[PDB]
From a paper:
We, thus, designed compound 2, which contained a 7-diethylamino (7-Et2N) coumarin unit. The coumarin-substituted electron-donating groups at position 7 showed strong fluorescence and thus we expected the designed probe 2 to be sufficiently fluorescent to be useful for PPARγ binding assays. We attempted to crystallize human PPARγ-LBD complexed with 2 or 6 to identify the binding mode of PPARγ-LBD. Crystals were grown in the presence of each ligand but 6 provided only the apo structure of PPARγ. The overall crystal structure of the 2/PPARγ-LBD complex was similar to that of the rosiglitazone/PPARγ-LBD complex. The TZD moiety formed hydrogen bonds with His323, Tyr473, Ser289, and Gln286, which was identical to that of rosiglitazone in PPARγ-LBD. The fluorescence maxima shifted to shorter wavelength and the fluorescence intensity increased upon increasing the concentration of PPARγ-LBD. The determined Ki values therefore showed an identical relationship with the reported EC50 values, suggesting that 2 and 6, PPARγ ligands that incorporate 7-Et2N coumarin, were useful probes for competitive binding assays of PPARγ ligands.
PPARγ is an important target molecule for the inflammatory disease and metabolic syndrome.
Author numbering:
A (entry chain B): 207 to 239, 243 to 269, 275 to 461, 467 to 474
B (entry chain A): 207 to 239, 241 to 263, 275 to 474
Amino acid sequence: ESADLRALAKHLYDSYIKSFPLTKAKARAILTGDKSPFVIYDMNSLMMGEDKIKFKHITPKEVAIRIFQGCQFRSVEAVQEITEYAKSIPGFVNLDLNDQVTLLKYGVHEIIYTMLASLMNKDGVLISEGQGFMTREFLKSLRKPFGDFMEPKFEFAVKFNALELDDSDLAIFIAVIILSGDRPGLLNVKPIEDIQDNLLQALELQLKLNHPESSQLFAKLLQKMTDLRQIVTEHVQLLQVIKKTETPLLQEIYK
Amino acid sequence: ESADLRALAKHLYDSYIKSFPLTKAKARAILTGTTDKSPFVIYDMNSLMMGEDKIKKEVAIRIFQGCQFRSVEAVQEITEYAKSIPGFVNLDLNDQVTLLKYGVHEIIYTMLASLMNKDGVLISEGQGFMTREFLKSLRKPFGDFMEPKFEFAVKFNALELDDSDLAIFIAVIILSGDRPGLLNVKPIEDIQDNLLQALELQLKLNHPESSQLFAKLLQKMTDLRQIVTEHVQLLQVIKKTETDMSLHPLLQEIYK
Ligand SMILES: CCN(CC)c1ccc2c(N(C)CCOc3ccc(C[C@@H]4SC(=O)NC4=O)cc3)cc(=O)oc2c1
C-alpha cells in the first residue's frame, strides 16, 4: 500500500529533522542569501574566525593539520547523529547487535559525504553549524597532501546537488545506504535486505510524487552510490598516506 | 508508453543474440550437464596438457595471454552490439570511443559471470571448463587474477538474469554519462534514461516476484568498477615482474 510507504517516508523525514540540526533547507538559505556566515578565504580570515567562532576542536600545530583534525572532530560528531537516526528506521534495532554495529561502521562515511553535499556549492562548504563558510580555493591551496582532501567531495557534491534532492528525499536515501546487505561480516543478511527493499519502495514513491518530471531520478540516485563508494575508497587511501606525513586519548577518540 | 519500451527491449535482445555467439542460456545448458555439449575439464597441469590437445611458454602466461585474446574478441562483439543501440552511432565520435573505452571491461566481467559457477569457467565457446581451484593455484602474481571475477559472478548470478535482461543492462553500461572526458554528456543521458525505463519495465514483467531487482542490479555497477580497478593494479605488477610478456595493443589502448 502507498499509505504504508508514505507513513515510512514521513517517519524518516521527522527523524532526520530531529537527528540533523543543519538541514539542507537551512544550509541552502545560508549559501545563497540576512546574517551572512563568517567567510574563511585565506590564513588571516581563518586566524580571525577562530577568535570570532568558538571552535570546539582547538587545543593549546600547522594550519593544514588543525583544519584536517577539525574535519575528523565533525565526522565523529556526525557518526553520533547518524547512529541515533538509524535507531528510528523500522526494523533496525531488532537486527542482530553485531550487524547493527557492522552496517553503522561501513555506512557512516557514505552518509557523511552525502550530507556534506547539502552544505557545499562549487565555491565552498558550511562549517560549525553554518556559522562559517570555508572557500574551496583556500582548501585547495593547503600543503600536499592536504591540498585536495576536499576536492573529491566538492566534485561529488556539485554533481549530487544537480539532482536537487530535498531533505524528505535524503531521509529515505540515507536509510537505504545504512541497510546494505553487501557489508562484510554480516551474520543475517535477509532481514537487512527486507528492510532495504521497503526503504527502496518508499524512496521510489517519494521521488515519483516529489519530482514527477525528473525522469528515472530513482535510477540516477542509485547510480550515485557508485560515486559514494569511490569517494570513500580514495578517502581511506588519503588517510593511509597521512600515516606517512603525521610525524594519545585524542588518537583513540578518532582511531 | 510500455509499447515503445517493449519494442526497444526486443530490438536490444535481437542484436544481443546477433552479436554474442555464446549466450547465458547456452552456457547454463553446458554447465548443468545432455550428451551433445559436455565440456572437457581442466583441473590440473596433466588435464591442461590433455585439453590443449582436444579443444585447441609457461602455463600461467599461456592462460593470461588466452584471457587477453578472448577480451579482444569480446571487445569486437561489444563494439558491434554498441552500434545497434539507438542513438549510439549519432553521438560525437570522440564520445563513442570514450563510451567503449570505459564500458568494455564492465561488460566483459558482466558477461563472463554468465560462463561461471562457484567451481569454474567455460572457455573456448563452451568446449572447455577450467576449475576455480586450478586458476587459484597459479604462481604469483596470476594466482588471484580470476578470484575477484569469480566472487563477483557468484553474487551477480544469484539475481538469475536471463539474456533478455542482460541485453538492456549492458546497453545501460555503455551509455554512461559520467565517463571521464565526455564532450556531450546530455545526449548520452537521454539515451540512458530511455534504456533505464526499458530495463525497469523488462525486470518487472520478466521477474514479477523479485522485489526491487532494478535497484539491486544498478548497485552491481559498483562491484564492476572494483573488478576493473583491482585488475589495472594487477596489470602494473605483471608489467614489472614479466618484462618478457606481450600485451595486445588493443587492451593497452583501452587501459591508457
Ligand atoms: C592456450 C590458452 N588457454 C588454455 C591455457 C586458455 C585459457 C583460458 C581461456 C579463457 N578463460 C580462462 C576465461 C578467463 O576469462 C577472462 C579473464 C580475464 C579477462 C580480461 C582480460 S585479461 C587482461 O589482462 N585484460 C583483459 O581484458 C577476460 C576473460 C577463455 C577462453 O575463451 O579461452 C581461454 C583459453
